[PDB]
Coordinates of C-alpha atoms in Angstrom, one line a residue:
Chain Y
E1 CA -12.0 27.6 26.2
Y2 CA -8.8 27.6 28.3
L3 CA -7.0 24.3 28.8
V4 CA -4.4 23.9 31.5
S5 CA -0.8 23.5 30.2
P6 CA 0.6 20.1 31.1
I7 CA 4.2 21.4 30.9
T8 CA 4.0 24.9 32.5
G9 CA 0.7 24.8 34.4
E10 CA -0.7 27.9 32.8
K11 CA -3.9 28.2 30.6
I12 CA -3.9 28.6 26.9
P13 CA -6.9 29.0 24.5
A14 CA -7.7 25.7 22.8
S15 CA -6.9 27.2 19.4
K16 CA -3.2 27.1 20.4
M17 CA -2.9 23.6 22.1
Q18 CA -0.8 21.9 19.5
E19 CA 1.5 24.9 18.7
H20 CA 2.1 25.6 22.4
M21 CA 3.0 22.0 23.0
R22 CA 5.3 21.8 20.0
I23 CA 7.0 25.1 20.9
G24 CA 7.1 24.4 24.6
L25 CA 9.1 21.1 24.1
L26 CA 11.5 22.7 21.6
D27 CA 15.0 21.6 22.5
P28 CA 17.6 24.5 22.8
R29 CA 19.9 22.1 21.0
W30 CA 17.9 23.0 17.9
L31 CA 18.7 26.7 18.5
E32 CA 22.4 26.0 18.9
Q33 CA 22.4 23.7 15.9
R34 CA 20.7 26.4 13.8
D35 CA 23.1 29.0 15.0
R36 CA 26.1 26.8 14.1
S37 CA 24.6 26.1 10.6
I38 CA 24.1 29.9 10.1
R39 CA 27.7 30.5 11.1
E40 CA 29.0 27.8 8.7
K41 CA 27.1 28.8 5.5
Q42 CA 27.8 32.5 5.9
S43 CA 31.6 32.2 6.3
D44 CA 32.7 29.7 3.6
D45 CA 34.4 31.3 0.6
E46 CA 33.0 30.7 -2.8
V47 CA 34.9 28.1 -4.8
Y48 CA 33.6 28.7 -8.4
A49 CA 33.9 31.9 -10.3
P50 CA 31.0 34.4 -10.4
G51 CA 28.6 34.5 -13.3
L52 CA 30.1 37.5 -15.1
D53 CA 33.6 36.0 -14.7
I54 CA 32.3 32.7 -16.2
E55 CA 30.8 34.7 -19.1
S56 CA 34.1 36.6 -19.7
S57 CA 36.1 33.4 -19.5
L58 CA 33.8 31.7 -22.1
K59 CA 34.1 34.8 -24.3
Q60 CA 37.9 34.5 -24.2
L61 CA 37.7 30.8 -24.9
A62 CA 35.4 31.5 -27.9
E63 CA 37.8 34.2 -29.1
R64 CA 40.8 31.8 -28.9
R65 CA 38.9 28.7 -30.2
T66 CA 37.8 29.2 -33.8
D67 CA 37.5 25.4 -34.5
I68 CA 34.3 25.6 -32.3
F69 CA 33.0 29.2 -32.5
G70 CA 33.0 32.0 -35.0
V71 CA 32.6 31.9 -38.7
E72 CA 36.2 31.7 -40.0
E73 CA 38.5 28.9 -38.5
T74 CA 42.0 29.7 -37.6
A75 CA 44.4 27.4 -35.6
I76 CA 43.5 26.0 -32.2
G77 CA 45.4 28.7 -30.3
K78 CA 45.2 31.7 -32.6
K79 CA 42.8 34.6 -32.3
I80 CA 43.1 36.7 -35.5
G81 CA 40.2 34.9 -37.2
Chain E
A1 CA -34.8 -26.8 -9.6
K2 CA -34.2 -23.6 -7.6
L3 CA -31.6 -21.5 -9.4
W4 CA -33.2 -22.1 -12.8
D5 CA -36.7 -21.4 -11.4
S6 CA -35.6 -18.2 -9.6
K7 CA -33.8 -17.1 -12.8
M8 CA -37.1 -16.4 -14.6
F9 CA -38.4 -14.4 -11.6
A10 CA -35.1 -12.5 -11.5
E11 CA -35.2 -11.8 -15.2
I12 CA -38.9 -10.6 -15.0
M13 CA -38.2 -8.3 -12.1
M14 CA -35.0 -6.9 -13.8
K15 CA -37.0 -6.3 -17.0
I16 CA -39.8 -4.5 -15.1
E17 CA -37.4 -2.3 -13.2
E18 CA -35.3 -1.7 -16.3
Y19 CA -38.5 -0.4 -18.1
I20 CA -39.0 1.8 -15.0
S21 CA -35.4 3.0 -15.3
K22 CA -35.8 3.8 -19.0
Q23 CA -39.0 5.7 -18.3
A24 CA -37.2 7.7 -15.6
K25 CA -34.3 8.4 -18.0
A26 CA -36.8 9.6 -20.7
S27 CA -38.7 11.7 -18.1
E28 CA -35.6 13.4 -16.7
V29 CA -34.4 14.4 -20.2
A30 CA -45.3 10.7 -6.4
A31 CA -42.6 8.2 -7.5
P32 CA -39.5 10.3 -6.9
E33 CA -36.2 9.6 -8.8
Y34 CA -34.3 8.6 -5.6
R35 CA -36.4 5.5 -5.1
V36 CA -35.6 4.6 -8.7
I37 CA -31.9 4.9 -7.9
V38 CA -32.3 2.8 -4.8
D39 CA -34.2 0.1 -6.8
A40 CA -31.5 0.1 -9.5
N41 CA -28.7 -0.2 -6.9
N42 CA -30.5 -3.1 -5.2
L43 CA -30.9 -4.6 -8.7
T44 CA -27.1 -4.4 -9.0
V45 CA -26.7 -6.6 -5.8
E46 CA -29.4 -9.0 -7.0
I47 CA -27.7 -9.3 -10.4
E48 CA -24.3 -9.9 -8.8
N49 CA -25.8 -12.6 -6.4
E50 CA -27.4 -14.3 -9.4
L51 CA -24.4 -14.1 -11.6
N52 CA -22.1 -15.6 -9.0
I53 CA -24.6 -18.5 -8.6
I54 CA -24.7 -19.0 -12.4
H55 CA -20.9 -18.9 -12.5
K56 CA -20.7 -21.5 -9.7
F57 CA -23.2 -23.7 -11.6
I58 CA -21.2 -23.4 -14.9
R59 CA -18.0 -24.1 -13.0
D60 CA -19.5 -27.3 -11.5
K61 CA -20.9 -28.4 -14.9
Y62 CA -17.8 -27.5 -17.0
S63 CA -15.4 -29.1 -14.5
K64 CA -16.2 -32.5 -16.1
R65 CA -14.8 -31.2 -19.4
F66 CA -11.8 -29.0 -18.5
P67 CA -11.5 -29.0 -14.7
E68 CA -8.3 -26.8 -14.6
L69 CA -9.7 -23.7 -16.3
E70 CA -11.3 -22.5 -13.0
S71 CA -7.8 -21.9 -11.5
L72 CA -6.3 -20.4 -14.6
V73 CA -9.3 -18.0 -15.0
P74 CA -10.5 -16.8 -11.6
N75 CA -12.7 -14.0 -12.9
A76 CA -16.4 -15.0 -13.2
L77 CA -17.2 -13.2 -16.5
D78 CA -13.9 -14.2 -18.1
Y79 CA -14.6 -17.8 -17.0
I80 CA -18.0 -17.7 -18.6
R81 CA -16.8 -16.2 -21.9
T82 CA -13.9 -18.7 -22.0
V83 CA -16.1 -21.7 -21.5
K84 CA -18.5 -20.3 -24.1
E85 CA -15.7 -19.8 -26.7
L86 CA -14.0 -23.2 -26.1
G87 CA -17.1 -25.2 -25.5
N88 CA -16.8 -29.0 -25.7
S89 CA -14.0 -28.8 -28.4
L90 CA -11.0 -27.5 -26.6
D91 CA -8.7 -27.8 -29.7
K92 CA -10.9 -26.1 -32.2
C93 CA -8.7 -23.1 -33.1
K94 CA -10.5 -21.0 -30.5
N95 CA -7.1 -20.0 -29.1
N96 CA -6.4 -17.4 -31.7
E97 CA -10.2 -16.5 -31.8
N98 CA -11.9 -14.0 -29.5
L99 CA -9.9 -15.3 -26.5
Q100 CA -7.4 -12.6 -27.1
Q101 CA -10.1 -10.1 -26.1
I102 CA -11.3 -12.2 -23.2
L103 CA -7.9 -13.1 -21.7
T104 CA -4.3 -11.9 -21.5
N105 CA -1.9 -13.5 -24.0
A106 CA 0.1 -15.1 -21.2
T107 CA -3.0 -16.7 -19.6
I108 CA -4.1 -17.7 -23.1
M109 CA -1.0 -19.7 -23.7
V110 CA -1.3 -21.1 -20.1
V111 CA -4.9 -22.3 -20.7
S112 CA -3.9 -23.7 -24.1
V113 CA -1.0 -25.6 -22.6
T114 CA -3.3 -26.9 -19.8
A115 CA -5.9 -28.0 -22.3
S116 CA -3.2 -29.9 -24.2
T117 CA -3.2 -32.4 -21.3
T118 CA -6.8 -31.9 -20.0
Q119 CA -7.5 -35.5 -19.0
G120 CA -11.2 -34.6 -19.1
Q121 CA -14.0 -36.4 -21.0
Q122 CA -16.4 -34.8 -23.4
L123 CA -19.7 -33.5 -22.3
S124 CA -23.1 -34.8 -23.3
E125 CA -25.3 -32.9 -25.7
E126 CA -27.8 -32.0 -22.9
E127 CA -24.8 -30.8 -20.8
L128 CA -23.7 -28.7 -23.8
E129 CA -27.2 -27.1 -24.3
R130 CA -27.4 -26.4 -20.6
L131 CA -24.0 -24.8 -20.6
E132 CA -24.7 -22.5 -23.5
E133 CA -28.1 -21.6 -22.0
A134 CA -26.4 -20.7 -18.7
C135 CA -23.7 -18.7 -20.5
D136 CA -26.3 -16.8 -22.6
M137 CA -28.3 -16.0 -19.4
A138 CA -25.1 -14.8 -17.7
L139 CA -24.2 -12.6 -20.6
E140 CA -27.7 -11.1 -20.7
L141 CA -27.4 -10.5 -16.9
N142 CA -24.0 -8.8 -17.5
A143 CA -25.6 -6.6 -20.2
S144 CA -28.4 -5.6 -17.9
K145 CA -25.9 -4.8 -15.2
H146 CA -24.0 -2.6 -17.7
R147 CA -27.2 -0.8 -18.6
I148 CA -28.0 -0.2 -14.9
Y149 CA -24.4 1.0 -14.3
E150 CA -24.8 3.4 -17.3
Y151 CA -28.1 4.8 -15.9
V152 CA -26.7 5.2 -12.4
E153 CA -23.5 6.9 -13.8
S154 CA -25.8 9.2 -15.7
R155 CA -27.4 10.3 -12.4
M156 CA -24.3 10.5 -10.2
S157 CA -24.5 14.3 -10.1
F158 CA -27.4 14.1 -7.7
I159 CA -27.1 11.0 -5.6
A160 CA -23.4 11.5 -4.8
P161 CA -22.5 15.0 -6.0
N162 CA -19.4 15.2 -3.8
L163 CA -18.0 11.8 -4.6
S164 CA -18.5 12.4 -8.3
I165 CA -16.0 15.3 -8.2
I166 CA -13.1 13.2 -6.8
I167 CA -13.0 10.0 -9.0
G168 CA -15.6 10.8 -11.6
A169 CA -19.1 9.3 -12.3
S170 CA -17.8 6.0 -13.8
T171 CA -15.7 5.0 -10.9
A172 CA -18.4 6.3 -8.6
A173 CA -20.9 4.0 -10.3
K174 CA -18.6 1.0 -10.1
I175 CA -17.8 1.5 -6.4
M176 CA -21.5 2.2 -5.5
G177 CA -22.6 -0.9 -7.4
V178 CA -20.0 -3.2 -5.9
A179 CA -20.5 -1.8 -2.4
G180 CA -24.3 -2.5 -2.5
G181 CA -25.4 1.1 -2.1
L182 CA -24.4 4.6 -1.0
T183 CA -25.4 3.8 2.5
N184 CA -23.4 0.6 2.4
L185 CA -20.5 2.5 1.0
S186 CA -20.6 5.0 3.8
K187 CA -20.7 2.3 6.5
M188 CA -17.4 1.0 5.3
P189 CA -13.8 1.8 6.3
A190 CA -11.5 3.5 3.8
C191 CA -9.2 0.5 3.7
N192 CA -12.1 -1.7 2.4
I193 CA -13.2 0.9 -0.1
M194 CA -9.7 1.0 -1.6
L195 CA -10.0 -2.8 -2.3
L196 CA -13.5 -2.5 -3.9
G197 CA -13.5 -4.2 -7.3
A198 CA -10.1 -5.9 -6.6
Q199 CA -9.6 -9.2 -8.4
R200 CA -7.3 -12.0 -7.2
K201 CA -5.6 -12.2 -10.6
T202 CA -3.6 -15.3 -11.1
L203 CA 0.2 -14.8 -11.5
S204 CA 1.5 -17.0 -14.3
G205 CA 5.2 -17.4 -13.5
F206 CA 5.5 -13.8 -12.4
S207 CA 6.1 -12.0 -9.1
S208 CA 3.0 -10.8 -7.2
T209 CA 4.3 -7.2 -7.8
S210 CA 4.0 -7.5 -11.6
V211 CA 0.3 -8.5 -11.3
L212 CA -0.9 -5.5 -9.2
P213 CA -2.4 -7.0 -6.0
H214 CA -4.8 -5.4 -3.6
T215 CA -5.8 -2.9 -6.3
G216 CA -9.4 -2.0 -7.0
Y217 CA -11.4 0.5 -9.0
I218 CA -9.9 3.5 -7.2
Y219 CA -6.4 2.3 -8.1
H220 CA -7.4 2.3 -11.8
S221 CA -9.3 5.6 -11.6
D222 CA -8.2 8.5 -13.8
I223 CA -6.6 10.6 -11.1
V224 CA -4.7 7.7 -9.4
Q225 CA -3.5 6.3 -12.7
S226 CA -2.1 9.7 -13.7
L227 CA 0.7 9.4 -11.2
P228 CA 4.0 7.6 -11.8
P229 CA 3.8 3.9 -10.8
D230 CA 6.0 4.3 -7.8
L231 CA 3.5 6.7 -6.2
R232 CA 0.2 5.1 -7.2
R233 CA -0.2 3.1 -4.0
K234 CA -0.1 6.2 -1.8
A235 CA -2.3 7.9 -4.4
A236 CA -4.9 5.1 -4.2
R237 CA -4.9 5.2 -0.4
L238 CA -5.3 8.9 -0.2
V239 CA -8.0 9.0 -2.9
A240 CA -9.9 6.1 -1.2
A241 CA -9.8 7.9 2.2
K242 CA -11.1 11.1 0.6
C243 CA -13.8 9.2 -1.3
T244 CA -14.9 7.5 1.9
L245 CA -15.2 11.0 3.5
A246 CA -17.2 12.2 0.5
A247 CA -19.5 9.1 0.5
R248 CA -20.2 9.7 4.2
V249 CA -21.0 13.3 3.5
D250 CA -23.1 12.2 0.4
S251 CA -25.2 9.6 2.3
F252 CA -26.6 12.4 4.4
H253 CA -27.3 14.5 1.3
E254 CA -25.2 17.4 2.5
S255 CA -23.0 19.8 0.5
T256 CA -25.2 19.0 -2.6
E257 CA -23.4 21.8 -4.4
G258 CA -20.1 19.8 -4.1
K259 CA -18.2 22.1 -1.8
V260 CA -16.9 19.2 0.2
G261 CA -16.1 17.4 -3.0
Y262 CA -14.2 20.4 -4.4
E263 CA -12.3 20.9 -1.2
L264 CA -11.3 17.2 -1.0
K265 CA -10.2 17.2 -4.7
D266 CA -8.1 20.3 -4.1
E267 CA -6.5 18.7 -1.1
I268 CA -5.8 15.6 -3.2
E269 CA -4.3 17.7 -6.0
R270 CA -2.1 19.6 -3.5
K271 CA -0.8 16.3 -2.0
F272 CA -0.1 14.9 -5.4
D273 CA 1.8 18.1 -6.4
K274 CA 3.8 17.8 -3.1
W275 CA 4.7 14.2 -4.0
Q276 CA 5.7 15.5 -7.5
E277 CA 7.6 18.4 -6.0
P278 CA 11.2 18.6 -7.3
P279 CA 13.9 17.8 -4.7
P280 CA 15.4 20.8 -2.9
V281 CA 18.9 22.1 -3.3
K282 CA 21.3 20.0 -1.1
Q283 CA 24.7 21.3 -0.1
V284 CA 27.8 19.3 -1.1
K285 CA 29.8 18.1 1.9
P286 CA 33.5 18.9 1.4
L287 CA 36.2 16.5 2.4
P288 CA 37.4 17.0 6.0
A289 CA 40.8 18.7 6.2
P290 CA 43.6 16.4 7.3
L291 CA 44.4 16.8 11.0
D292 CA 47.6 15.9 12.9
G293 CA 46.7 17.2 16.4
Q294 CA 46.3 14.8 19.3
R295 CA 42.8 13.7 20.1
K296 CA 41.8 12.3 23.5
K297 CA 39.3 9.4 23.4
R298 CA 37.5 7.9 26.3
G299 CA 37.9 4.4 27.7
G300 CA 35.6 2.1 29.6
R301 CA 33.3 -0.8 28.8
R302 CA 32.5 0.2 25.3
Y303 CA 36.2 0.8 24.5
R304 CA 37.1 -2.5 26.1
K305 CA 34.5 -4.3 23.9
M306 CA 35.7 -2.6 20.7
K307 CA 39.3 -3.4 21.6
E308 CA 38.3 -7.1 22.2
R309 CA 36.6 -7.3 18.9
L310 CA 39.0 -5.4 16.6
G311 CA 42.1 -6.6 18.6
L312 CA 44.5 -9.2 17.2
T313 CA 43.5 -12.8 18.1
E314 CA 45.8 -15.8 18.7
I315 CA 44.3 -17.6 15.8
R316 CA 45.1 -14.5 13.6
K317 CA 48.4 -13.8 15.3
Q318 CA 49.5 -17.4 14.5
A319 CA 48.1 -17.2 10.9
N320 CA 50.3 -14.1 10.3
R321 CA 53.5 -16.0 11.0
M322 CA 55.1 -17.9 8.1
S323 CA 58.0 -20.2 8.8
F324 CA 61.4 -19.5 7.2
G325 CA 62.5 -22.2 4.8
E326 CA 59.5 -24.5 5.5
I327 CA 58.0 -24.7 2.0
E328 CA 54.4 -25.6 2.7
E329 CA 51.9 -27.2 0.4
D330 CA 49.1 -25.4 -1.5
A331 CA 45.8 -25.8 0.3
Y332 CA 43.5 -23.6 -1.9
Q333 CA 43.3 -24.1 -5.6
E334 CA 41.1 -21.0 -6.2
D335 CA 43.6 -18.6 -4.6
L336 CA 47.4 -19.3 -4.5
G337 CA 49.6 -17.6 -2.0
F338 CA 46.9 -18.1 0.5
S339 CA 48.2 -20.0 3.5
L340 CA 47.3 -20.7 7.1
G341 CA 50.9 -19.8 8.1
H342 CA 51.7 -21.4 11.5
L343 CA 48.1 -22.7 12.0
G344 CA 48.3 -26.5 12.3
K345 CA 51.9 -26.6 11.0
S346 CA 55.3 -27.6 12.5
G347 CA 57.4 -24.9 14.1
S348 CA 54.4 -23.1 15.5
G349 CA 55.6 -24.0 19.0
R350 CA 52.1 -24.8 20.3
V351 CA 51.2 -28.5 20.9
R352 CA 47.4 -27.7 21.2
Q353 CA 45.5 -25.9 18.5
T354 CA 44.3 -22.4 19.4
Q355 CA 40.6 -22.1 20.2
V356 CA 38.1 -19.9 18.4
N357 CA 37.6 -16.5 20.1
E358 CA 33.9 -16.1 20.7
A359 CA 34.3 -12.3 20.7
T360 CA 34.9 -12.4 16.9
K361 CA 31.7 -14.4 16.3
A362 CA 29.5 -13.1 13.5
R363 CA 26.4 -11.1 14.6
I364 CA 23.7 -9.3 12.7
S365 CA 22.6 -5.6 13.0
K366 CA 20.0 -4.4 15.4
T367 CA 17.8 -3.1 12.6
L368 CA 18.3 -6.3 10.7
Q369 CA 17.4 -8.3 13.8
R370 CA 14.2 -6.2 14.1
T371 CA 13.4 -7.0 10.5
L372 CA 14.0 -10.7 11.1
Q373 CA 11.7 -10.6 14.2
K374 CA 9.0 -8.9 12.1
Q375 CA 9.3 -11.5 9.4
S376 CA 8.5 -14.2 12.0
Chain C
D1 CA -21.7 26.6 20.0
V2 CA -21.7 22.9 19.0
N3 CA -23.4 21.3 16.0
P4 CA -27.0 20.3 16.9
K5 CA -26.5 17.1 14.8
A6 CA -24.4 15.9 17.8
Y7 CA -27.4 15.6 20.2
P8 CA -25.8 13.1 22.7
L9 CA -23.2 15.6 23.8
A10 CA -21.5 15.1 27.2
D11 CA -21.1 17.7 29.8
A12 CA -17.8 18.7 31.5
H13 CA -17.8 16.0 34.2
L14 CA -18.7 13.3 31.7
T15 CA -16.2 14.7 29.2
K16 CA -13.4 14.4 31.9
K17 CA -14.5 10.9 32.9
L18 CA -14.7 9.8 29.2
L19 CA -11.2 11.2 28.4
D20 CA -9.8 9.5 31.5
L21 CA -11.3 6.2 30.5
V22 CA -10.0 6.6 26.9
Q23 CA -6.5 7.2 28.2
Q24 CA -6.7 4.2 30.5
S25 CA -8.0 2.1 27.6
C26 CA -5.0 3.3 25.5
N27 CA -2.7 2.3 28.3
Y28 CA -4.3 -1.1 28.5
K29 CA -4.1 -1.7 24.7
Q30 CA -7.9 -1.6 24.4
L31 CA -8.5 1.5 22.2
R32 CA -8.8 2.0 18.5
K33 CA -8.2 5.5 17.0
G34 CA -9.9 7.0 14.0
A35 CA -13.4 6.7 12.4
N36 CA -12.3 3.8 10.1
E37 CA -11.0 1.7 13.0
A38 CA -14.2 2.6 14.9
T39 CA -16.3 1.3 12.0
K40 CA -14.2 -1.8 11.8
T41 CA -14.7 -2.5 15.5
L42 CA -18.4 -1.9 15.2
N43 CA -18.7 -4.3 12.3
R44 CA -16.8 -7.0 14.3
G45 CA -18.9 -6.3 17.4
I46 CA -15.8 -5.9 19.6
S47 CA -16.6 -2.3 20.7
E48 CA -17.8 -1.3 24.2
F49 CA -18.6 2.3 23.2
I50 CA -17.7 4.9 20.6
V51 CA -16.5 8.4 21.5
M52 CA -16.5 10.9 18.7
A53 CA -15.8 14.6 18.6
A54 CA -18.3 17.4 17.8
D55 CA -15.7 19.6 16.0
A56 CA -15.3 17.3 13.0
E57 CA -15.8 19.4 9.8
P58 CA -18.0 18.4 8.2
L59 CA -19.7 16.4 11.1
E60 CA -21.3 14.1 8.5
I61 CA -18.0 12.2 8.1
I62 CA -18.7 10.6 11.5
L63 CA -22.5 10.7 11.6
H64 CA -22.6 7.2 10.2
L65 CA -21.1 5.9 13.5
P66 CA -24.4 6.5 15.5
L67 CA -26.3 4.5 12.9
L68 CA -23.8 1.6 13.2
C69 CA -23.9 1.9 17.0
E70 CA -27.7 1.6 16.9
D71 CA -27.5 -1.4 14.5
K72 CA -24.9 -3.1 16.7
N73 CA -26.4 -2.0 20.1
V74 CA -23.3 -0.1 21.2
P75 CA -23.5 3.1 23.3
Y76 CA -22.1 6.3 21.7
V77 CA -21.4 9.8 22.9
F78 CA -20.1 13.1 21.4
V79 CA -17.3 15.1 23.0
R80 CA -16.9 18.8 22.5
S81 CA -13.2 18.8 21.4
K82 CA -11.4 16.8 18.7
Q83 CA -8.0 17.9 20.1
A84 CA -8.5 16.8 23.7
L85 CA -10.0 13.5 22.4
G86 CA -6.8 12.9 20.3
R87 CA -4.6 13.7 23.3
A88 CA -6.6 11.3 25.5
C89 CA -6.0 8.6 22.8
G90 CA -2.2 9.3 23.2
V91 CA -1.8 10.9 19.7
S92 CA -0.9 14.6 19.2
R93 CA -3.0 14.7 16.0
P94 CA -6.7 15.3 16.5
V95 CA -8.9 12.3 16.6
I96 CA -12.6 12.6 15.7
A97 CA -13.6 9.0 16.7
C98 CA -12.2 6.5 19.1
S99 CA -13.5 3.0 20.0
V100 CA -12.9 1.2 23.3
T101 CA -12.6 -2.5 22.5
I102 CA -13.7 -5.6 24.5
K103 CA -11.0 -7.4 26.4
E104 CA -12.1 -10.3 28.7
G105 CA -10.7 -10.1 32.2
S106 CA -9.7 -6.4 31.8
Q107 CA -9.6 -4.4 34.9
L108 CA -11.4 -1.6 33.1
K109 CA -14.6 -3.6 32.7
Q110 CA -16.3 -2.0 35.7
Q111 CA -15.4 1.6 34.6
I112 CA -16.5 0.7 31.0
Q113 CA -19.9 -0.5 32.3
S114 CA -20.3 2.6 34.4
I115 CA -19.5 4.8 31.5
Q116 CA -21.9 2.8 29.3
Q117 CA -24.7 3.3 31.8
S118 CA -23.9 7.0 32.1
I119 CA -23.9 7.5 28.3
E120 CA -27.0 5.4 27.6
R121 CA -29.1 7.6 30.0
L122 CA -27.8 10.9 28.6
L123 CA -28.8 10.8 24.9
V124 CA -32.3 12.1 25.7
Chain U
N1 CA 29.7 -38.6 -40.8
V2 CA 29.4 -34.9 -39.8
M3 CA 30.2 -33.2 -36.5
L4 CA 28.0 -30.2 -35.6
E5 CA 28.9 -28.0 -32.7
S6 CA 26.8 -24.8 -31.9
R7 CA 25.1 -22.9 -29.2
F8 CA 21.5 -22.0 -28.3
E9 CA 21.9 -18.3 -29.1
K10 CA 20.3 -16.0 -26.5
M11 CA 19.3 -19.1 -24.5
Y12 CA 18.9 -17.3 -21.1
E13 CA 17.6 -14.0 -22.4
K14 CA 14.8 -15.7 -24.4
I15 CA 13.4 -17.9 -21.6
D16 CA 9.7 -17.1 -21.2
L17 CA 8.7 -17.1 -17.6
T18 CA 5.2 -18.4 -18.1
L19 CA 6.3 -21.3 -20.3
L20 CA 9.2 -22.0 -17.9
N21 CA 6.9 -22.0 -14.9
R22 CA 4.4 -24.3 -16.7
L23 CA 7.2 -26.7 -17.6
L24 CA 8.5 -26.6 -14.1
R25 CA 5.1 -27.7 -12.8
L26 CA 5.9 -31.0 -14.5
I27 CA 9.0 -31.8 -12.4
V28 CA 8.5 -30.0 -9.1
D29 CA 5.7 -28.9 -6.8
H30 CA 3.5 -26.0 -8.1
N31 CA 4.6 -23.9 -5.1
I32 CA 8.3 -24.5 -5.7
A33 CA 8.0 -23.8 -9.4
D34 CA 6.1 -20.6 -8.8
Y35 CA 8.8 -19.5 -6.3
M36 CA 11.6 -20.1 -8.8
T37 CA 9.8 -18.4 -11.7
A38 CA 8.7 -15.4 -9.6
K39 CA 12.2 -15.0 -8.4
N40 CA 13.3 -14.2 -12.0
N41 CA 10.7 -11.4 -12.1
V42 CA 12.6 -8.9 -10.0
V43 CA 13.8 -5.3 -10.3
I44 CA 17.3 -5.1 -11.6
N45 CA 19.3 -2.1 -10.1
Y46 CA 22.7 -0.6 -11.1
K47 CA 23.5 2.7 -9.4
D48 CA 20.6 5.0 -10.5
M49 CA 19.1 2.7 -13.1

């Protein structure tokens, strides 16, 4: 069950007509675009703080904000209670 | 003369075959059962073709009393129930009676308002008696049709095992009855099957979108109705296509286990899940960094045309000039400060008025032009 | 091999001729793709002949087409591949049934008649 | 003698489309009235609502 390739002239089994045609007409522009995209997303510095840093910052905020957190309520900026 | 005479024969045949159906139902729980199903499904067509004739007869007879009710109530059964309820006395408190079950509230108020100015004479007593006789016969035929549909729905696990899996036995019964048979259902495109059981419901001062058009039994099936309303059209189309495939399989009595039906239902569920799939994570595009380096841009025909379009025009060059000490008069109440400047005013230095530049003429988008062409 | 339910199966030469005629009909805007469009053409009596594939799974989803062809007196044939049939129709997706419509004054009329004669003498 | 000045409160928001259409049939063609009344039955959009 070999069908002649309309794009290369070779013979492929009929189980691989559609995939051979889709791959055969794949623009190298797709390859260069994918390479560019890979370069961009693997080189940009992270903007927001990591998760552990976020947790530590929230812990410091809770320590220094007793009007929201904790049991006892000290002033807005104080940490003793 | 003919419809009335044939009504007795139709009723006798329906009674005999309904006794046969009851005997088959009792026996199930050489006269095979498949022939019984075929006879019942032909009975459905016969009952439909007698009920539409009865509805036409009632519509012709009742048109003397309230001629406008046919347009307000297009459904045959609803028409019959409404003319039975109202009868000769339109203003007889029937509006707040069983009409609320027969009709929607909006169409109830519409029909009441129309009956307020009927301009139709009363019907004779013989015309009455004939009308209630026809209505009772039609209701009995509808009850017999309901019984036949119940019996067929009870036996859908054998005649159409594959199609039962997709939409259930009730919707299967409805589509098989309205199509005229499983064989008739199979010899029918999926687009027509999706519209099976659809009703041209009247829109009473509403958009055609509010009153769901081109929607049939499949659109109101359990699986299709379980999707959000924005995806129910695609759901109806896909389910109708798969039901057509199952019916074509079923009419040849293949995959009696339901393997084709289970595969089609699994495919439908997978497609529904894909439609319900949450959107993927999409990267935020940062603002481009400001740039001061020189950038070389090509010229040519395109650049010339853009320069001609965006370029300053003599009509606009002259409107940007305002005379010094020449206090003009206000020409626009709705926006002060607005002025034509040197356009058509002394001191412009031009005897003749500047012509309109045709390069600045308004034009529509290419896609918009395509849409306008399609609308034609 | 192929499903015996598809008894009017064409050989290699007739398969090539049928695919060529299907492509020419597509170029002439005289072809309908899909089993539903084939059924619509059969019901409207504007179909010269119906070409359907033998790899449809299950094959019963297009076995109603021979019955409609017999009812409407339209020749029908089975081709061995649903992927080549789709390609002949001009669509990358597989097509399991294509209908060649009737267009008066079409230059394909002679080829359509020849293919009809070839098909109608091949079923048995 | 008494001067009464008032408003029809919620005049626009309480207009029934069915009754408005049926009242419009009395002064214009049924096709025009149906167009005008179906025009008020449209989707209202504001950003993501």
